[model samples]
Target: MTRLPKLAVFDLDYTLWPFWVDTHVDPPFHKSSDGTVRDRRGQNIQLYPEVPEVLGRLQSLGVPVAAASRTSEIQGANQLLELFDLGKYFIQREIYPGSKVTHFERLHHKTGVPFSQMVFFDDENRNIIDVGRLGVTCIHIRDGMSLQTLTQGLETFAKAQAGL
Candidate 1:
């Protein structure tokens, strides 16, 4: 049997959630329009349709998922656990801002996992590129706010992980 990768790290905002605004608390980074902010309340704030399934599948295949988000640890853990029941899926959730790359680097070191064996998915190109520079495979989730784009990006990630 082919051994799965040790870890899969995902960004929360645009990658998992429907939109990219910090709904947890009002701060400098919560940059959503009034209408979008209102809509976010009704929206479940989840991963794309196939995302939950993908995570479940990965777990079944013995691959662990981790979250490296830019949100506060309290908000990210509480909200994501409440919304997606991520505790069932993710092995670790590290949340921080200012230097998410640094956070991920430390995680890799602590876990003793090779950066090459881990994959990172984020909605921001800048972050993707930055992490990529550290020798981690990075997938940039396009910023169209559409299911098609999100799925396509995710599918690309799946294929890459599968070595296809």
Candidate 2:
């Protein structure tokens, strides 16, 4: 349990944000003439306070991150990630309305990183089990993803890699 994975995949919504993007966001955000997205009260999307710092540190260490969400509001979710500038750290995204397995598969396809070399983080129990079945190291986030969970994730991932 010692190093980061080839791809650090995350589940949006409760994992990245505090709520479901599909219900919370107005969906199909309105962009200004300059194409800048503004969050209306309808889509009050906010990343957890710890997100930027964690992402930045991972980016600084050359770790490639990605997202795996089942949010029906794919566009809204993408908007939030982009709106919050969290998208910058991710090399690829599978932020669509579908199974977590597909997300992991597509992410592997795009990034060319096998599930065995990937670590997944999510707040949902179902998702963690689903992604884990794909040979990915899974970390369950309660409340939200914090530095403690993140550290545990990386460490657990390394241990899984070694133990396997």
Candidate 3:
């Protein structure tokens, strides 16, 4: 029998979106009537394609999703998620400037989910390598999060549970 992870964690900046939250865009993002998100400087911003569907798919599978970000633009990141209508998907969000280990540690403490029962996706190898040490199945995301990446990560998690 196949098993799903108790928690699925994601990195914010380049994982869900293309640009760095702290540097590339201005803060106080808002969604317009046309459903486009723009920064305070009126610059357009967007998340990676398929990100919404991937989060929704995980939610449909009864997996609680969470956001872990090392971005210093905490307000901006949260604003972007809210503007993108992704807020409801995350049960917990740990956004700050520090090692991702701190973020993951806080997540484990708050959610009470063991590291082994979690799966993580991030575009940065440093975060992946750091978080991997904690026993969480970490997926190295190339070209952001898409259905393909999500599928592969889940399959990897299942394999680990199967002791393969």
Candidate 4:
């Protein structure tokens, strides 16, 4: 429960962005010649508001980031990831169908960071509990990602690291 992590794994879907990428959007979304993807209803899917700022702040802090998503629409998620040019943010992209544990396991294996040294952010309560028990400092995103919540979470993590 402390400090910046060598690797921070983020849950996609409802966590990084709003709505479930698998269910909310239709298939065969239009892909523009410019590599832009549009929803079937002709709406440009967007990330949750303020997510860029929060991620940018984290990047400025020099923490490596990764994505841990369980959305069945792996293709959609990937499309959106490319659509928004978000590929550079996450060092580890574990987007597939499985438990969050699988994602964490791969992240650890990939980054060599122990659970205790890793920080996680998720919107699901169950995921929070699962990772928390594994000794990973986890923050719950009740709404969407917010700078205030991210700051508070990092402070709490640092406090925990202080052994307080």
Please report the candidate that would top TM-score against the real structure. Answer: 3
List all candidate RMSDs to the true structure.
6.3, 3.2, 0.9, 2.5
Of 1 and 2, the candidate ahead on lDDT is: 2
lDDT, candidate 2, at 89? 88
Deviation (Å) of 45 in candidate 4: 1.2
After superposition, the stretches of candidate 2 with alpha carbons farther than 4 Å from their true spots are 28-38, 42-44
TM-score of 4: 0.89
lDDT of 3 by residue, 42-161 (tens): 888988899999999999999999999988888888888888889999999999999899999999999999999999999889999999999999998889999999999999999999
Quantify all predictions' global Cα lDDT against the true fold. 0.64, 0.78, 0.92, 0.80
Question: What TM-score does each of the candidates earn?
Answer: 0.69, 0.87, 0.96, 0.89
Stretches of candidate 1 exceeding 4 Å from the true structure: 1-3, 21-46, 72-77, 143-164
Candidate 2 structure lDDT: 0.78
Q: lDDT per residue, candidate 4, 1-164, as tens digits?
A: 34676667788877767888777788556666766567887766667777787778889999888888888988878777776777877787988987788888888898989888888889898889877888898988878777887788788678778885
Clashing pairs in 2: 1-159
Q: Write the per-residue lDDT of candidate 1 for residues 41-157, one digit (tens) a residue.
A: 354343555666667766876777787877654464445554455578887777777667786887787678888777777878888877888777777766422446534545565
Cα displacement (Å) at residue 83, model 3: 0.8
By lDDT, the best candidate is: 3
- Give the lDDT ranking, best first: 3, 4, 2, 1
